[PDB]
Amino acid sequence: IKQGIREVILCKDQDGKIGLRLKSIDNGIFVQLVQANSPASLVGLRFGDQVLQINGENCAGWSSDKAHKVLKQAFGEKITMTIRDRPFERTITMHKDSTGHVGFIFKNGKITSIVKDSSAARNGLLTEHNICEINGQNVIGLKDSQIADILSTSGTVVTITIMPAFIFEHIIKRMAPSIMKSLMDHTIPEV
Prior knowledge:
Layout: E1 5-10, E2 20-25, E3 28-34, H1 39-43, E4 50-54, E5 57-58, H2 64-73, E6 79-84, E7 90-95, E8 104-107, E9 110-114, H3 119-122, E10 129-134, E11 137-138, H4 144-152, E12 157-164, H5 165-171, H6 177-183
Antiparallel strand pairs: 1-6, 2-3, 4-5, 4-6, 7-12, 8-9, 9-10, 10-11, 10-12
């Protein structure tokens, strides 16, 4: 999580899409979904990102509906966005033991207990937290089985981006759990 604000310049694809759904939270605007192979994915927009400005207009107090409308009407040659990096999330580094365990249990993406004497315990991992990312890889809507595989197939260093359940549940409302699975960018980013 980068310690401040950044500018991203976007250009609609040949269909007029940027590949982004936005959700009103606490009078801000947050990224609900980033489409794979969209302008939004290429410039590095992330689920949970805060959008402070679009074309140097303040987003404060906008409905989800208005934010989507503003994006529709943009002279898409170039769109400037001001972004606060994943303000509701935090990152935890843990180390697998001799058995390839970091030391927790999750269910529907949500960490549910921590295992006594684990790296997860030593690093103060919290329950009632949804897994958003693993080593930078968005994992939102994947089956539990696929998240395990990403942990299994990760280095011995595992980085996890977590979000308080209540907040996570408030962002993903009004988007079906098939779109999450299907359309949420789950790719390692390009260079």
